[PDB]
């Protein structure tokens, strides 16, 4: 991997605070498109390109990465709505900062941290975004992390990173973006 920002190679000083507005939009989980085979062409390509895993190994890795029951997330400049099972839950959020994590392979990434201001947020009280960026820019897709204890609890989760792309894309278009 080239030593670029989006591959996780960046200077600490370039990491800058963001706002929830970077993530505003109507977003969909990519997991159904792994499950229905749309991403098989992605895993075949990755296996042939990098040689680091077989196609089946890549698929298992991304199955663990993408699994979630949160099928849709709708975000405004100050709210997030999670659609999960047969229920929608919407809360107001404030920005609470950022965290630089180091991964086992030696690259790094930044989590951008939000906290619900509503008392009844439960498992959606603490929410983090990772999008391979480190400073303000409109998100094009993201991984999300959420729970009800603290931001710090979520820093331990490294292998499940539910992933979201804009609702206006087909699964095929998401696959194209991943192949690019
Ligand atoms: O982030 C991904 O989608 C898959 N990552 C591994 C998982 N991520 C999780 C994260 O970014 O929060 C870590 C990473 O990309 O180093 C490998 C890759 O991008 O080639
Ligand atoms: Na889930
Ligand atoms: Na997660």
Residue numbers in the entry: 321 to 500
What does the original paper state about this entry?
Zinc is essential for virulence and survival and is acquired solely by the ABC transporter, AdcCB, and two Zn2+-specific cluster A-I SBPs, AdcA and AdcAII, in S. pneumoniae. Although both SBPs share this structural core, AdcA also has a C-terminal domain (residues 322 to 501; here termed AdcAC) that is structurally related to ZinT, a periplasmic protein from E. coli and Salmonella. The AdcAC domain is linked to the N-terminal cluster A-I domain of AdcA (residues 1 to 311, henceforth referred to as AdcAN) by an 11-amino-acid linking region. Collectively, our data show that the AdcAN domain is necessary and sufficient for Zn2+ acquisition, with the AdcAC domain and the His-rich loop aiding in Zn2+ recruitment during growth under Zn2+-restricted conditions.
The AdcAC domain has a lipocalin-like fold of an 8-stranded up-and-down β-barrel (β9-16) and a helical region of four short helices (α11 to α15). The structure of the AdcAC domain was further analyzed compared to a truncated AdcA variant lacking AdcAN, AdcAC (residues 326 to 501). The structure of metal-free truncated AdcAC was also determined, showing that only minor conformational changes are induced by metal binding. The metal-binding site in the AdcAC domain is also tightly defined. However, it is highly solvent accessible and is permissive for interaction with Co2+ and Ni2+ ions, similar to ZinT homologs.
